[PDB]
Amino acid sequence: CSKQREILKQRKVKARLTIAAVLYLLFMIGELVGGYIANSLAIMTDALHMLTNLSAIILTLLALWLSSKSPTKRFTFGFHRLEVLSAMISVLLVYILMGFLLYEAVQRTIHMNYEINGDIMLITAAVGVAVNVIMGFLLNQSQDSLAVRAAFVHALGNLVQSVGVLIAAYIIRFKPEYKIADPICTYVFSLLVAFTTFRIIWDTVVIILEGVPSHLNVDYIKEALMKIEDVYSVEDLNIWSLTSGKSTAIVHIQLIPGSSSKWEEVQSKANHLLLNTFGMYRCTIQLQSYR
Amino acid sequence: CSKQREILKQRKVKARLTIAAVLYLLFMIGELVGGYIANSLAIMTDALHMLTNLSAIILTLLALWLSSKSPTKRFTFGFHRLEVLSAMISVLLVYILMGFLLYEAVQRTIHMNYEINGDIMLITAAVGVAVNVIMGFLLNQSQDSLAVRAAFVHALGNLVQSVGVLIAAYIIRFKPEYKIADPICTYVFSLLVAFTTFRIIWDTVVIILEGVPSHLNVDYIKEALMKIEDVYSVEDLNIWSLTSGKSTAIVHIQLIPGSSSKWEEVQSKANHLLLNTFGMYRCTIQLQSYR
The missing domain is CATH 1.20.1510.10 (Cation efflux protein transmembrane domain)
Incomplete structure (x- = not known):
């Protein structure tokens, strides 16, 4: 709502x-x-x-x-x-x-x-x-x-x-x-x-200066995203705020090897988690298969 | 190089x-x-x-x-x-x-x-x-x-x-x-x-103010992105520059219905196109299947 x-x-x-x-x-x-x-x-x-x-x-x-x-x-x-x-x-x-x-x-x-x-x-x-x-x-x-x-x-x-x-x-x-x-x-x-x-x-x-807001820590967010099923790493997790209360994020999940079809589910899970549990007025994530 | x-x-x-x-x-x-x-x-x-x-x-x-x-x-x-x-x-x-x-x-x-x-x-x-x-x-x-x-x-x-x-x-x-x-x-x-x-x-x-650089027009970039095969729309195409010469972008391609497996290829094509033909010191794109 x-x-x-x-x-x-x-x-x-x-x-x-x-x-x-x-x-x-x-x-x-x-x-x-x-x-x-x-x-x-x-x-x-x-x-x-x-x-x-x-x-x-x-x-x-x-x-x-x-x-x-x-x-x-x-x-x-x-x-x-x-x-x-x-x-x-x-x-x-x-x-x-x-x-x-x-x-x-x-x-x-x-x-x-x-x-x-x-x-x-x-x-x-x-x-x-x-x-x-x-x-x-x-x-x-x-x-x-x-x-x-x-x-x-x-x-x-x-x-x-x-x-x-x-x-x-x-x-x-x-x-x-x-x-x-x-x-x-x-x-x-x-x-x-x-x-x-x-x-x-x-x-x-x-x-x-495009720094993270003072009420957010990268390590905790990175660990939370790494806790998601079918996630191998977080290459980059850029976070910045347009203004106080409106903070966005860019996320670079890499997928677990052997499971590349399950990308939409991982994207939805990461988006919902970031939004609900950190604010994240809008967030965008990019998925890469295993190298 | x-x-x-x-x-x-x-x-x-x-x-x-x-x-x-x-x-x-x-x-x-x-x-x-x-x-x-x-x-x-x-x-x-x-x-x-x-x-x-x-x-x-x-x-x-x-x-x-x-x-x-x-x-x-x-x-x-x-x-x-x-x-x-x-x-x-x-x-x-x-x-x-x-x-x-x-x-x-x-x-x-x-x-x-x-x-x-x-x-x-x-x-x-x-x-x-x-x-x-x-x-x-x-x-x-x-x-x-x-x-x-x-x-x-x-x-x-x-x-x-x-x-x-x-x-x-x-x-x-x-x-x-x-x-x-x-x-x-x-x-x-x-x-x-x-x-x-x-x-x-x-x-x-x-x-x-997170505005696009004066040497870039979103409409041309949007049309170029839409020209990529297996692309249905561009929901949002944020562009901003950290400084002169270092400009990033966020892209929200939506995939053609009936072709969702071919997402990595579309992502690579969009990334390569944006980088080579517009600078784009770094760009991140997010793909969504057809609604």
Whole structure:
């Protein structure tokens, strides 16, 4: 009954992504009007962060819509790699935002006077954690979809930066002769953001480089296929994934000598085994008689 | 005799790349010592451009060396996608250099006085074309290797920028009340550089997205496969390339009813045809009896 199962998954993913996008836009407008009645550009400065989050989500939605298209004559496989590309784009945007914050901090640690803000820094950090914790529960997930995972990683990075800014504002508020704690918090929590993004970066790079997914081991699959009756060897067992949840395989069973007619049965057994017990959105196998 | 042929091409590509790298290093040293006796930082400014070119070539060499490794249990295919990644990196660095030039020009078009240099601008442009025209013949190439193609594209972009700077400097030299033409040439030749990089960007993106190579049409291959004796249909004919020159395929021949024993012959015929008449560094086909 898996013919239409994936449709429900993409519908849920799209619904969650549009809900997140409209929530981000609503928070954007709310913070903008709040800053307008509070005539402060520092509050408006978070509009850029909301912009990059919303742009990443919009690009993800476009990539998913394109991926829903049927394969063409130029792309024999589907457009599922567009979702991976959108994930890389989102990671690049969060890295760019972290780099901008890092440059602002490195300019903060020198030139003196540190451009003191005060209480207003606490408020923009208080809403940063409050907004991002809502998005974290929305994109919780806990195979999973790579798009929502990338959105959740972006939300977690934004939450880490927000809590770092909150901590820095609090330590500045009490005993304000320190006046310097903000750049160190910026550095430490930028490192933490990199730690958060490490796993998704590794998974995406492995996906692009035609490596096996991290949740599959070749030795176990090879032994399982070798357990099939009338199988002599597995010459090559290439495995790669178009995207998270859509992983294919190429298999090169060699037949037992003296039994070459029983090739269709072996092919069906291998196909059914691979599909049912490893996912294998589609798999193709090639049989060779004994040499 | 194709078992050891490809070794010769990788050896030649590596030799050419090291020759280009050492030529870049020698020109770097020559221009650096030349600037020291001419005590001008503008001459030293091209050291950054030679740095990015040399770094791109070095990353390409590392990617090729890694690609020469045998497939592992995490990457069932080879590391050939590292060469494609290095090509994207080279494109990204040339785009970054163009963006830095564009930002400098947009700062020149305003704030007045345009930071006049004069004759010394002609010299750094005269050696820019002379250096790049030499390696343009070196990386002439004219399937080809993607690494040398990316290096040649980078060299061509650098040559275009150099000739643009030369034209702007010559325009400034005569009738020097104009004094404005330099950013205009910068914009026009940045657009030309983007035009040069368009084709390699498109090819690399198609390679990553699991699209068929631009020099292959599925319909012709499908008709050729259908021309094979004892073939009823081609259910699916996936084609993708790990890198330029290494393209694989997956084929789903269905057998003519009443003839199922003659499956090995059909498989061998299809494999030989695909390999010899389309390249197909490796291809795998799966046969199904009539339904």
